[PDB]
Amino acid sequence: MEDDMACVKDLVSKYLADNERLSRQKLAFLVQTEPRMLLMEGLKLLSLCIEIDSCNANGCEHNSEDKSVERILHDHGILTPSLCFVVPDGYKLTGNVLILLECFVRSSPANFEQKYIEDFKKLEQLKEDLKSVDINLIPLIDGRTSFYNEQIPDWVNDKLRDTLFSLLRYAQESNSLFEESEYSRLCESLSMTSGRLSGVESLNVLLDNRSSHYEEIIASCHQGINNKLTAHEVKLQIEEEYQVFRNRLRKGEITGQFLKVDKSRLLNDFNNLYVDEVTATKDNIEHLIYQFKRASPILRFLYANIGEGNGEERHHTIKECQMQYWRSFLNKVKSLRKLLLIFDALILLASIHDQTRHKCSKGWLGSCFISVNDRLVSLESTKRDLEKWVGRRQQSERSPPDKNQILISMFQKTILKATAALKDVGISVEHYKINMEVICPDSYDLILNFDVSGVVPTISYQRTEDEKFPFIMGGVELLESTDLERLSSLSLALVNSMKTSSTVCKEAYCQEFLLSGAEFQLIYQKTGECSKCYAINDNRVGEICSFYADPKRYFPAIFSAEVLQTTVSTMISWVKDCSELEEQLCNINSLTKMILVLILAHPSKRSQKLLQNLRYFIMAYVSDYHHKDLIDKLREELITDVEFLLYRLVRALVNLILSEDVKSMMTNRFKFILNISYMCHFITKETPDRLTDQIKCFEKFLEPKLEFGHVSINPADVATEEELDDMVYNAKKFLSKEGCTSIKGPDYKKPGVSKRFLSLLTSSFNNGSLFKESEVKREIKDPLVTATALDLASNKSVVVNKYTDGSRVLNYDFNKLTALAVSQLTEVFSRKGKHLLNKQDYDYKVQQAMSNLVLGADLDEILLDGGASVYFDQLKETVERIIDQYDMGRLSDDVRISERESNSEALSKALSLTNCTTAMLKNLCFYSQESPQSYSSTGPDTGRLKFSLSYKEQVGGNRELYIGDLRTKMFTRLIEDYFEALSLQLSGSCLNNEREFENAILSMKLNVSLAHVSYSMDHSKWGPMMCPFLFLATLQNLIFLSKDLQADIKGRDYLSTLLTWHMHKMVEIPFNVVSAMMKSFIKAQLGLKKKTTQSITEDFFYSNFQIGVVPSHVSSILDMGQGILHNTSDFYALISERFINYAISCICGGTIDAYTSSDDQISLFDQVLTELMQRDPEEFKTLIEFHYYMSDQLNKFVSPKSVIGRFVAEFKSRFYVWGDEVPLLTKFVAAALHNIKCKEPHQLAETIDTIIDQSVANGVPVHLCNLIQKRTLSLLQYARYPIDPFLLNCETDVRDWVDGNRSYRIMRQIERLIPDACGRIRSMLRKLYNKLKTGQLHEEFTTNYLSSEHLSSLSNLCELLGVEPPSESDLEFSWLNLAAHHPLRMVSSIASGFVGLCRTLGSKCVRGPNKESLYIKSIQSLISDIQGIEPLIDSHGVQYWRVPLNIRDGNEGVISYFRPLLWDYMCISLSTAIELGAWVLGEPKKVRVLEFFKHNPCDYFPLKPAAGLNHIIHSLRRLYPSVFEKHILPFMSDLASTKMKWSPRIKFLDLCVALDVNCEEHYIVLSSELRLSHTRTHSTSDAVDNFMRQIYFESYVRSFVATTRTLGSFTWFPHKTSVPEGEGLQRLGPFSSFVEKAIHKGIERPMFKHDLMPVPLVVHRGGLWECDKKLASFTPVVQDQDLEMFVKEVGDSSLDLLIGALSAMILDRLKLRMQWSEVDIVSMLKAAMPSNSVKVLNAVLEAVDDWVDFKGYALCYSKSRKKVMVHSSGGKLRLKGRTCEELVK
């Protein structure tokens, strides 16, 4: 701690600015040693700096020696009788008036105002005495809320504050020094405020251990460049480069790289794309449909001819047998945690009785049957075990009873046990209709006397059995919609197959499903979720099919039978008017369907990619130029005998639509093919297998970092010599690319940058030649001036390091790993390896030997003969010497070198070791116990920056993911925020800003409308080809602030340090990758497997495996964070593209505009270039080529999927054409299908609502939306959850979505249920709203009827408004609301989520009155047993109940849930009418007068919907202080030292807030549906005048000085917000120039007389005054309500204040001849002062002495009579030449 005071003494000696006024306290503090002394002196020093700065900023000389105002005046030459001793903190005199001052710091509005009021009273209590010497006092007060002074660099400031706070925390000293009050005040005084800066400057509190390495790096990145060229040499450089490039290209020495599109050649190249196994050139539709319906066993089963033998049994599905009830009962009671045989015999005899009564053949499959737990039960072993068990039972009895009696007696015990066990909570027994006659007299014999017959089915995993199909091949037709529901039922069976638990021939499982009267059984043999074999069976044939599907990946087909049909129908409807296409429409109507079914039968990644890659082809077919390497990118791979059929289908369809016979409609065909391409979303975005996916990522990551040749395996925490050597070497190499003036010429697709072009770019930026005029008038401010960390809490994972000693581990223990690998492989082998030609053929011997080795003589030679001799010996040695140390439990995690943790856990752990218990950034990485002290050029002292690898799913390919630890994320946030703030300055980016994207859309539309050229660009390998070194090398040569060179130099060093920190990172290799590589090495060492590939990433591992060390971490120079350094990369891209456009415009005579986000980009050409395209094609082509080459020279490549055209534009997947519009009808549907989760069923609803709302606004017709909502409701019903009207509304129209919101739709549904009751309610609500908008009652219902029992609220409201209340046969309606007292208890993939939801909503999940646990069935029973309540079900399924109010009481148990419907309807309707407009409360007028017409399906029509914060904040701080201070001040505010005591109020808004605490840029619709809908019948000037009236009102209560701190301290003020140059400058009178010249520049000084066209100004009542003279004035207009608020707030306690103020206002507004006729007085006084207006009336009217006009009268004062006289024609009394009468007699 001594070091603390030492270093802070050094700081305060050094960085304190020279001023003899600080010398005294400087010394007095720089000498003490006792802590308390240091605390006192230091705090006094800080307060001294504060008061000095304040007195400077106000203009009052500093009272230094702490004189007394008595002395201050008497040594100034005046007489003072006697005063109370006061000490001022500054003062000034001006003639006969005086100015004092006092300042302090408080950081809490509660403990703020106290000092304020205390000081004000301390000053007035002296003014009262001063008044008798003819001297005016003006009590100024100032209230700064932060110790951030001005004579001190702020980082020194907090470095002092925190060390003081720490030293002060001596427990014994703190206790035996003071009490808790001042202790608590001080600790919250050193609060570690976020300050006014970034937080990177704090780097100056560490040791700068930079060395020659950093010097070398900087000098190298700064050597050959020249960032000084004038604006005249750049053009010369460019023109010479262009000349050389053009000339050297014409001779055919550089490659073309761009073709011109010829449609026939494109179609040819697409046709024979796979021409090595698709041996054909043109296929026929008939053979296609032929072999389609027979390809795969699933497809074969779908279309076959089943269900023809259907007689009465097709109708015998409802006449249920007792076996069903008994099985359901057994399954329900089983969950209530030998007996299996009891269940078998029970169900068996139940089926026996059912067969003797009606011969129902159900639940029987050949010679087996399903008993309880989805298990298929055989026959013979059941009877065998039952006989042996009854024999053992009777034997143990005899060691007379016959087995029959034993069996008939062993039922009742368990039956009663079950009937009692279920009766723990709720459900009765009388609902499960189970006839007790099951126990027949001759039970045991009749069970022993029952055999059956049939066929025994069995799964087939061998082939040659799936070629003799029982039924006929093709029976169904495509036009119908029959196959879809077959698919639905089959998929439902598959998903349900995941339900079975472990449950622990021999074993099997079965799941039945019905199909058009028939019944089938899907059987399998292993639980859990993983690919396996299934088999379909029936009780008439056997093994219809067998296949190898996967449980999940089959969700999107459930219950979606009509959705897909309507999809295909409305898709075909697009192209049906092309005459040339008519005679083949039927053909099309087939193909589409087929494709869809295929993509839903077998989902697979390869089909997804194949379908996706078609969008680029169709985009190219319409363009003008394209990249020559395009086609080769669309030829990835294909494997099985299904995808080829898909390729042929899509080829036929493409040739059919795009054939060279058509001219009619290109737009519709474009839209059709594009929507076909977007069908890829229907499949899944998950992964087939995880491990084999976790290797392709590593391959992606490692390969480009070997061709460059820079890899450093296993770096250490302290950098050695060789690493730094090669680092500088590679940094030197990177900057040595060349081209176009050389021998070998340019080489494309190689990472690096050329010095010439880099110097050109930097020098071009440093001339202002890249700035638009609107950007050059606004000088670039330094980004250091502006930080919650909760943003970092976004659920992401965080790595946690691992320590063994004072050091941390960064290596995989080699010897420990091979033991784990060998144990794992013997584990996987010993349970499977005995299933081949065993007994020493070639390989069983070796695995058996080395497996017996680990589990606790010829074979030796037979193994070691092949040279695998010494390796085996050393392996045995190491494994036997490592196993002694211990298991599979210890080494399982020791070899692991890291582990993961959630995001909030680590944040809490870190917060527990600091002083500020909040979330600040600069506080968390710089001042804490675990914070570094010194830093080199390779990171801080605690080690270098570390990341870890993972992958991320996506549609199409996959993305990489780097995960760091806490410190790395901290240090990264700073760079990110710096570059983001810097990039906001310039125009063109679209990554974060919105309005830029809007402008991009507008420009795209405008460009397309005129057939101008457009260029759609996407860059390839944006991640692994950038590097932090490039951003560093381009930063050192940049100069933002050209005026001053003193801080930019200071700022850039920090960022150089941080980028250099990033440059030396360390990326960890995952675990499974290492383990798999080790296994493969061990296997291939002896010779066991294929040994064919040996790819580039295996020898890398092997060359280190066979020499000991294992690769653990990898460092290099050639990779930025893939998804880390976004903002900086975006900045670089923006600069680069602007420069390239500048160059191109310099060469030719055109002009280009650009828009970019991070790597996607769109470029719009101009008139001259479009014209040139048609004159000289060669010139245009060579311009494009030059653009390619130039862009390559700056490390920015171009992907072969970029296009140039005149027909279509594209940017961020938002296409555009001329006239028409392009909806992505398939993407949104596929999104909405599989988008359910496991939450409260009242949240899935709102999620689906948001999705459908977003989809309607793009072109999907509402019919599909209704169908989708109905599908979701059916999905809910399948889980047996009662539907209430507050879930969804499957009846919407277009005006419901365009105008209304969720509440409106629900209100509309309720209206639809029960009309003729809502009528009177709307009628009452009309008048209620009309009376509330003027504030008539405004108090009662919000406190009683919105609070008390709403049993008679409506009655009171209707009688209060005088309208007939609702009739009695209305208040019976209700709706069963579960979760009435507490919410429901609910504590990876999509299917698992659905299954979990189903299982959750089947157990105890409702909270009782206080605390219980009940089912849902039990509540059904309870509500059903009462015989007076009648439910009501709608056509869609919505339930609602009717309960009579006579029985509303007496039975308060079950009735505790039901709620009355009309009450909720009224509440919702009122709240909505508040939120939306008032037009809602009209009546629903529907239109139906229309004649049918030809509705062109491609005809759209845009639409826009029909839509003061200061007042909200005012009301919050005025009404709810506790909630306000903790939720608005820390969020974004500092307004503790701000006044608001004169501001208008609103009653409507007030009661709205009281209730609330009590209780979409366009639309694109079809005009075919804007015709069929419903209808419903029927600031800034404010802010400026608010400020003006605030000032005017305060001017009369007292006197206050006019300065930059007095005015800005108020609340109504335009504090440099979004305000133009002249907005309210007319409404400022004598105050216009000051705000601009002083406040709106950042200048803190008082206002002088030279500020109206050396004494400061004084604001008096209305007019401005100097020392005893008035210069000017100002007076806005007043209202009745404003005067009411005035006399409210001023006339509360005192009276003479109100009298004087009113008299003065009347006087000074009369002598200007202003008019008072706009308002009243007497009624105003009464309405304002409801009890004492008379005496104040007399007082004011006696003060004045004249006449005053008002709202329809005029009064005056009399003196002969001491009363007031009204001017009136009926009076007689004389008063100032006017007739008058009295007021009140």
Ligand SMILES: [Mg+2]
């Ligand atoms: Mg793009």
Ligand SMILES: [Zn+2]
């Ligand atoms: Zn039956």
